Amino acid sequence: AQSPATISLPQGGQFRLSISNTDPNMIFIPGDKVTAITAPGGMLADKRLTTAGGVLFTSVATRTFTIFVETALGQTFSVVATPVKGEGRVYRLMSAEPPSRPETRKWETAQAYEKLLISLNRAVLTGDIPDGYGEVKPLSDGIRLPGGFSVTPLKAWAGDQLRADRYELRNANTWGVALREQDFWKPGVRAVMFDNNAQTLMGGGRMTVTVIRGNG
């Protein structure tokens, strides 16, 4: 039914959540696969690593403890659980700092630069994300604001080089302005694309933009 509950969790962060002592739970990471979990303090019943890349567990205690979930790409998080009555839950993890994937390094350095930017841009536009690119938390304030605009991040994809983002531009003003692509530049942005080829908005906020940052 619901969207999975999503959280931030920098490398080795803590987050306060609640789990159910019946109804086995699940924690899964997009872009990776969990290979270890060690959650003493409350002595969970059992652990089972699925094939998607999540981990299934269930507790029977009645007090707060800690759970250490560890990934394969050298990512380590920590969630402070609390057993409750029922209705088993599913959470999503979202590393705010992209990991390192040397396969993606050799894949990226294999080809040229401009064709690489074109590859990433078309993979963002269509939807088919390349193999080797994860999905990391969308960073705020990664672009300039030339005038009264209201940005709202949507999603981000990243690995080892050229982290890619997606934003939204809305004209909070009353008239129509000029959208020059070089206004939304910062020290670190490598490319900017306007999704619909509109030379000037009207006043309604339905314009998105893709930004290809670096050091992802």
């Binding site: 086995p24 019943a45 059992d46 089972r48 299934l56 269930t58 507790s59 029977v60």
Partner: peptide, 10 residues
């Protein structure tokens, strides 16, 4: 008292 019912097909 808490184990699961896990199965894999083929």
């Amino acid at each position: 008292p808490g184990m699961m019912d896990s199965q894999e097909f083929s």
